[PDB]
Design a protein around this ligand. Structure first.
Ligand code: HEC
Ligand code: HEC
Ligand code: HEC
Ligand code: HEC
Ligand code: HEC
Ligand code: HEC
Ligand code: HEC
Ligand code: HEC
Ligand code: HEC
Length: 289
């Protein structure tokens, strides 16, 4: 399948710099699947914000220059907080649109209302992924904008085709139900439908390639809720980090009650759950007669 646009189906993107880089001091080049993107975004100018479709690096070099308003390659590819242009087009970055996706799509917006992205090495590597078949020489030529289109296409194509998404933990790999009773007092324990929740959440995003590329560890989705602890099938209790009472030390951290409310309710509201509403108290935990 060829692209409508006439662009290569997948493209390797290099760190175009005014500073010579004989040692290849750089991030691993990024492979952009143009075909898959263009099939999801009809407006070519959403990305090619100046109109004519040309490499962003023609204007956005690592150092920045006149043609790009000194907006560097780093900024053009990872900007967040991009201001809405009063007139004309509001450019997008790779990161901002991806971020847009998690906030605008109901199936993404529940977990992403409660997830604080790590944006660690694994996150960088999702984009910075050119096949290891790329040689230092090819790296040098791409940097100089002298890599032949056929070699670029071939490196990009190999990258796309050699990708194998990670096998996540099944909902059967987590507990079926969890009696959340760490604070049981005025109400009964909340009998959480742990497995049903996980399974419903995963089904809604099954096959999404953006989601699959960035959820790249078997337990990543478990970290949605079990955050700030090593990826694991048996994470520590919320109660191990969240104190019953506001802890006067480190710091502003929600106490346990708020941790549960903010987390459970935060997702429900993020993916517009019909029930329970945050005011449906006995739906999550029956009042104690
Ligand atoms: C896709 C959404 C990306 C993620 C996440 C990260 N980067 Fe990136 N960045 C990506 C592209 C398309 C490009 C341009 C092509 C290239 O690889 O050069 C870049 C550019 C950079 C650069 C500038 C070039 C360089 O000197 O190698 C750097 C320094 C860079 N990116 C760093 C970086 C880091 C550290 C990231 C994780 C925290 C990261 N990027 C994620 C797109 C994407
Ligand atoms: C963002 C999700 C994209 C949309 C939608 C479209 N394109 Fe694109 N294209 C974009 C990038 C990030 C790249 C790689 C540029 C790089 O630095 O290598 C491009 C590249 C092209 C090109 C090749 C430019 C060249 O290297 O000189 C062409 C001809 C092109 N794109 C055409 C094109 C058309 C017509 C679009 C709508 C059908 C379109 N693109 C949308 C990403 C984005
Ligand atoms: C030169 C003809 C351009 C090409 C090709 C690309 N960009 Fe660009 N970019 C250019 C200018 C002159 C400016 C500033 C315009 C203004 O409204 O200020 C921009 C700025 C951006 C930004 C916004 C940065 C921010 O507001 O902080 C982004 C994210 C951006 N550009 C992205 C981008 C991408 C991804 C490109 C290829 C698909 C690309 N630009 C090409 C000029 C030029
Ligand atoms: C919205 C306007 C986008 C822009 C800007 C960029 N990407 Fe993107 N990304 C977008 C969607 C909707 C998807 C899913 C496409 C589909 O098949 O469903 C993707 C996903 C990716 C992926 C994951 C899969 C793959 O192609 O490897 C990668 C790593 C990716 N996007 C990279 C990427 C880079 C490097 C970008 C700037 C050059 C970039 N994307 C911009 C939507 C948007
Ligand atoms: C809970 C079951 C999730 C759903 C459904 C979706 N995502 Fe997700 N995502 C989740 C977690 C816990 C993480 C890890 C954060 C970090 O520590 O790395 C992520 C991460 C992403 C990312 C990368 C981080 C970022 O750039 O913000 C992307 C781009 C992403 N997720 C996209 C995404 C999309 C498009 C979804 C709907 C189709 C989606 N996610 C659903 C957990 C969950
Ligand atoms: C699910 C989305 C919730 C909604 C809606 C409400 N609560 Fe909640 N609550 C939730 C959890 C998972 C827990 C932990 C239960 C425990 O035993 O560990 C709590 C806890 C409380 C508590 C403390 C425990 C108790 O006294 O038994 C209080 C008093 C409480 N919740 C009050 C409360 C009120 C009044 C709500 C409606 C306005 C309400 N909760 C909604 C989950 C959820
Ligand atoms: C939010 C939607 C969750 C996701 C996604 C996962 N889990 Fe979970 N889990 C979460 C809560 C609120 C609870 C209660 C914790 C507490 O301290 O009250 C749990 C608990 C567990 C446990 C403990 C079971 C037991 O004590 O009976 C385990 C072992 C567990 N969770 C595993 C687990 C795995 C492996 C996940 C991904 C497949 C996963 N959880 C996701 C809420 C959330
Ligand atoms: C220690 C290893 C943690 C465990 C286990 C849990 N959480 Fe946590 N969480 C912890 C920190 C250090 C922080 C504060 C971060 C900061 O910005 O101050 C929190 C924060 C929360 C919050 C607020 C929103 C957030 O940033 O994610 C909530 C809603 C929350 N935590 C909920 C929560 C739940 C329900 C837990 C068990 C499933 C849980 N946390 C465990 C660190 C620790
Ligand atoms: C998204 C990441 C969620 C988190 C965190 C929690 N819930 Fe949830 N819940 C979620 C969905 C999307 C729905 C609607 C139905 C669907 O699957 O599409 C619900 C539903 C509930 C309900 C009713 C059905 C049930 O399975 O019991 C309850 C009572 C409920 N949720 C409780 C609950 C609690 C106590 C949570 C934190 C421990 C919690 N949910 C987190 C999405 C997500």
């Amino acid at each position: 399948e060829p692209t409508d646009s006439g662009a290569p189906s997948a493209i390797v993107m290099f760190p175009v710099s005014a500073k010579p880089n004989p040692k290849g001091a750089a991030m691993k080049p990024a492979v952009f699947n143009h075909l898959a993107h263009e099939k999801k975004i009809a407006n070519c100018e959403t990305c090619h914000h100046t109109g004519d479709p040309v490499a962003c690096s023609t204007c956005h070099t690592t150092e920045g220059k006149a043609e790009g308003n000194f907006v560097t390659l780093d900024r053009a590819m990872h900007a967040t907080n991009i201001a809405k242009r009063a007139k004309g087009n509001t450019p997008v970055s790779c990161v901002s649109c991806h971020e847009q996706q998690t906030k605008e799509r109901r199936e993404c917006a529940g977990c992403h209302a409660i997830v604080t992205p790590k944006r660690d090495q694994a996150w960088c590597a999702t984009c910075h992924n050119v096949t290891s078949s790329m040689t230092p020489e090819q790296m040098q030529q791409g940097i100089k904008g002298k890599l032949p289109p056929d070699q670029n296409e071939a490196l990009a194509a190999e990258t796309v085709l050699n990708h194998k998404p990670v096998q996540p933990l099944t909902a059967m790999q987590g507990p079926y139900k969890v009696s959340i009773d760490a604070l049981a007092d005025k109400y009964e324990p909340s009998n959480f439908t742990h497995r049903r929740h996980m399974a419903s959440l995963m089904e809604r995003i099954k096959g999404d390639k953006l989601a699959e590329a960035f959820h790249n560890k078997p337990e990543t989705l478990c970290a949605t809720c079990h955050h700030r602890s090593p990826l694991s099938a048996t994470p520590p209790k919320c109660g191990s980090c969240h104190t019953k009472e506001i802890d006067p030390a480190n710091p502003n951290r929600p106490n346990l009650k708020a941790a549960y409310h903010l987390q459970c309710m935060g997702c429900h509201q993020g993916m517009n759950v019909g029930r329970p509403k945050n005011t449906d108290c006995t739906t999550c935990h029956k009042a104690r007669p």
